[PDB]
Design a protein around this ligand. Sequence first.
Ligand SMILES: NC(=O)c1ccc[n+]([C@@H]2O[C@H](COP(=O)([O-])OP(=O)(O)OC[C@H]3O[C@@H](n4cnc5c(N)ncnc54)[C@H](OP(=O)(O)O)[C@@H]3O)[C@@H](O)[C@H]2O)c1
Ligand SMILES: NC(=O)c1ccc[n+]([C@@H]2O[C@H](COP(=O)([O-])OP(=O)(O)OC[C@H]3O[C@@H](n4cnc5c(N)ncnc54)[C@H](OP(=O)(O)O)[C@@H]3O)[C@@H](O)[C@H]2O)c1
Ligand SMILES: NC(=O)c1ccc[n+]([C@@H]2O[C@H](COP(=O)([O-])OP(=O)(O)OC[C@H]3O[C@@H](n4cnc5c(N)ncnc54)[C@H](OP(=O)(O)O)[C@@H]3O)[C@@H](O)[C@H]2O)c1
Ligand SMILES: NC(=O)c1ccc[n+]([C@@H]2O[C@H](COP(=O)([O-])OP(=O)(O)OC[C@H]3O[C@@H](n4cnc5c(N)ncnc54)[C@H](OP(=O)(O)O)[C@@H]3O)[C@@H](O)[C@H]2O)c1
Lengths: 247, 247, 247, 247
Amino acid sequence: GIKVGVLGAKGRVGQTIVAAVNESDDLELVAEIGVDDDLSLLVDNGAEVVVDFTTPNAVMGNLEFCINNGISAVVGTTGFDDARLEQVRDWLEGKDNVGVLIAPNFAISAVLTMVFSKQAARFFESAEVIELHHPNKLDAPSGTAIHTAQGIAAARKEAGMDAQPDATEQALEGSRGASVDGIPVHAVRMSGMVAHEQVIFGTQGQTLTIKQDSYDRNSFAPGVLVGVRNIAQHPGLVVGLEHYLGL
Amino acid sequence: GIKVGVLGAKGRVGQTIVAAVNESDDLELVAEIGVDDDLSLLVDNGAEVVVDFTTPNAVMGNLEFCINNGISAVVGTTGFDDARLEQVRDWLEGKDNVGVLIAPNFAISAVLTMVFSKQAARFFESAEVIELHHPNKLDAPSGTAIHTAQGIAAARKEAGMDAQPDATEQALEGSRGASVDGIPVHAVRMSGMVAHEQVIFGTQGQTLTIKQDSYDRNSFAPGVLVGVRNIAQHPGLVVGLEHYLGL
Amino acid sequence: GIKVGVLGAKGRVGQTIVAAVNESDDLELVAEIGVDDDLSLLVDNGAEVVVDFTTPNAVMGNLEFCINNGISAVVGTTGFDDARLEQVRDWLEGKDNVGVLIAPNFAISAVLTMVFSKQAARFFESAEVIELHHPNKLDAPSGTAIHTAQGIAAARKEAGMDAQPDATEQALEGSRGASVDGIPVHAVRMSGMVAHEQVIFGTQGQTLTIKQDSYDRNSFAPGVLVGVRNIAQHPGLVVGLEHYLGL
Amino acid sequence: GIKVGVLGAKGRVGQTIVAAVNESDDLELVAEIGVDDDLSLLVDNGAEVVVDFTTPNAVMGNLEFCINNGISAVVGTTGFDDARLEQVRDWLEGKDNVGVLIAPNFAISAVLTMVFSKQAARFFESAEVIELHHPNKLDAPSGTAIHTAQGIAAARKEAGMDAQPDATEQALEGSRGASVDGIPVHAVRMSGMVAHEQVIFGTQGQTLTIKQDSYDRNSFAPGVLVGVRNIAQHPGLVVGLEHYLGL
Ligand SMILES: NC(=O)c1ccc[n+]([C@@H]2O[C@H](COP(=O)([O-])OP(=O)(O)OC[C@H]3O[C@@H](n4cnc5c(N)ncnc54)[C@H](OP(=O)(O)O)[C@@H]3O)[C@@H](O)[C@H]2O)c1
Ligand SMILES: NC(=O)c1ccc[n+]([C@@H]2O[C@H](COP(=O)([O-])OP(=O)(O)OC[C@H]3O[C@@H](n4cnc5c(N)ncnc54)[C@H](OP(=O)(O)O)[C@@H]3O)[C@@H](O)[C@H]2O)c1
Ligand SMILES: NC(=O)c1ccc[n+]([C@@H]2O[C@H](COP(=O)([O-])OP(=O)(O)OC[C@H]3O[C@@H](n4cnc5c(N)ncnc54)[C@H](OP(=O)(O)O)[C@@H]3O)[C@@H](O)[C@H]2O)c1
Ligand SMILES: NC(=O)c1ccc[n+]([C@@H]2O[C@H](COP(=O)([O-])OP(=O)(O)OC[C@H]3O[C@@H](n4cnc5c(N)ncnc54)[C@H](OP(=O)(O)O)[C@@H]3O)[C@@H](O)[C@H]2O)c1
């Protein structure tokens, strides 16, 4: 008895959420809204939480409906700049029984990787990020690797640390990665692979590495279920799955 | 200007602490007590924190001296059962300017590995620990791997989770590791290696792995310096380096 | 202009071979035989090599047809005990223009892993095999890990080596893996994973590890194309993809 | 009863060879020549193989002596350009009982890594090299990583392969490594680490990785003992430890 609706129920990601919800013991799928269905269906079937993987063009309207009918929302749809977040916050004002989670990344293991990398960064002199993807990826490095590096660098700055140890004299071009706020980032492009990351931290005598591996590109359901299960404790707007992790 | 003394200054680990202290910018080595030197030296030279890597036979006396002369202490020496911890706590009663840290493990990367493994364990169905050591190691699995497994299992229990997914019918003896509170633990014994650990967590579509690697057996100084630097914020007795990590 | 037929063209594996053949520049798909089609189609369309992923019940008949019409064959279908191999060898007697490759494993990376593990084993004192699979796998350890261990052990015996270094006193049950001809084998069962193997070899100061990773269970086409491309240099029966690798 | 002399017996590497020889069962240390000892000692004590880790200034004289007294030689000393190799070959002419091995790298695991990388390269579309070292290393990438990349690229060219798959549009500077004959090479500089390499190969559905790890910088003895043990089967000059591996 969490009654759950899914917007974008027939999309690439939405299907996996319908499946996940059907497998669970505690969640009941009361509505599957695709592009042509009225949202009033969520009201009728008494949805309490909704999960949204739709489009940037649809999501603000739908979200406004949900919030205005008292339904909490777990939103994976992208496109949320500051102005849009300010819009969601404005709608939520004075509504203590409604929560919204906007998570630009729902891959629970990518998220824990960023969280743990930030916590570790205080304690090690050296930090590098290696990212590996299928060779059709256009952008290098990946957005996740850029974010991870920026998080480490902000952690290091907050702890007042030095920039890092390195005796390299005239490294060849490219050998030392892309420098992102002082953190080397290396991007590997490899047939057979999907999406992977390694953060390697180093200090006297030892290292710590945090590795993230996706064996396929449609594994958002564990993160989304963390959202659905916990949103009743997070009234108002929360941005980022990390804030639901209880860390 | 943290004036620091080292007890066991000539021992295997103590030397590395003397070195580390000498390299630093903020810590001044005012005393190096070996087995035949009076501890009053710490009083004379105005030691404020002491670091102890001595023996279980020496440490209680020395610690009692330090605490009774108002010197805080960072203790790596082993042998601290409950009764001994109760003794240290009794001595510290009503002494708001004295801190003691007793850390059964000062390898900052082993410690962060246990901490992060506990935090991650809520979120993944599968969890296994692989530990790898030089082949002269007597005990298998390692104490660190046992502790890590017990921490994961306590985390899982606290989150009310199931025991883990596995369709294995009549696994061969030994193939699935040693079960430690329900967590498989595999011990590899390998020439060339030192001490290494991997915690692998798994859920739909993805994994997270935390790897610890020691490239040699005398890398306790980063953890100990975390102790020395922070003990002024931890009056009383703290047991475990994790509690100094600000997590 | 290698004209290629595929038997089992509509099966799980056969489809991937049809696809691969269609993508190539040098191979022309002249026939796709499923269960209800006459094999004479291969003769009509002038097939020169055939690829077989069918069933153990079909394969001997089909293969006999191919060989008797002078068509060479790359066979992935399983079920080939000694008596069946002796049957294939008997049919091939005195037929210098016909080749058959029977490969119990067509995953080019699993095969190179076994080959390289055998070659390395002479030179290292320590050798262990770690295998990791999705947690629905029934058998532990995997057949590939068993074969890999047996290959290492045969290599070691051939080089007259000792059994391996290890100071372990009363290891806990299961901690040291399943012993397979003296090689420890550890099986990890992990949500998110597919099929992976690591062979770790160790000696003074160093290790060598060979890792195999499958990101999905339908990646036999690279190996099969090695077969199709090279079978014209391997008249007669060859068993095992390794013998086509030019090593 | 292989009587063995060591030139440079008191040097960093020579000591480890003296140790190794003393531990063995089959080799007898009959001479330890340092800088001030006559080489005639090798003749007196009936040395049959000599191991040389000295200096580029000493080695040609010493080697000429050894060869002219019929003693075979396993030479790790560096400095051997073509002209010097031509000199060694000239001295060895018509001397069927004398062998010399000049090995620019004696780390058995680095060598097997290059050998296996060359053999694998025919079969995979994607190939990258990641190298990791202590952060005092001056040069990036490492010489071993450069050599490994050049070997892969020569293998690929010999097999007539394409250059590699990659959809990357305007990668950031440095993100894709240093291109070495078309093979990406990434150099990581990390406190705690020693010297490590990974060659990652990729094709549809799968990868193969070969990892080399040194846990300390003085692990040449296994390779050198391969030399000493086998040199009696390699009369004349051989350059490179790989040629002694029986591959
Ligand atoms: N971690 C993350 O946060 C994460 C991960 C993956 C994807 N995403 C984002 O999630 C969104 C969906 O991605 P996807 O890969 O699932 O795309 P998709 O397969 O295109 O699915 C979008 C679905 O929403 C439906 N839709 C459009 N307007 C709608 C409306 N008003 N009400 C209900 N359904 C509507 C679509 O139907 P029509 O075809 O008729 O429009 C389609 O089934 C994208 O913005 C993507 O960027 C986020
Ligand atoms: N992570 C950890 O918390 C961690 C890590 C490593 C080691 N340890 C522990 O730390 C302790 C030391 O280990 P180690 O490897 O450094 O051993 P060690 O090399 O034997 O050093 C012990 C040193 O303490 C000296 N000593 C003995 N009694 C003393 C006294 N009353 N005052 C001052 N010095 C005294 C010894 O001198 P003498 O030879 O005259 O006795 C020796 O130099 C051990 O208990 C070990 O178990 C803990
Ligand atoms: N590395 C390896 O060597 C490797 C890897 C994977 C699989 N295999 C083996 O390859 C075989 C096929 O596996 P799979 O997963 O592709 O199984 P599958 O999906 O069942 O495919 C078998 C196909 O063969 C067809 N078939 C049956 N009899 C036939 C005939 N006389 N002529 C032509 N087609 C016929 C089947 O049609 P019907 O449904 O009408 O029978 C079906 O399309 C199995 O033996 C499996 O063990 C080997
Ligand atoms: N894989 C490889 O092939 C590999 C690996 C490591 C090192 N190396 C090379 O091996 C060589 C030695 O390196 P290392 O680190 O051992 O250097 P090292 O510690 O300087 O040792 C050189 C030794 O040779 C002695 N020596 C000099 N001239 C001699 C002579 N005529 N006869 C006998 N001994 C003599 C030196 O004594 P003095 O101090 O009096 O000169 C010293 O003990 C270097 O060229 C290094 O580049 C190669």
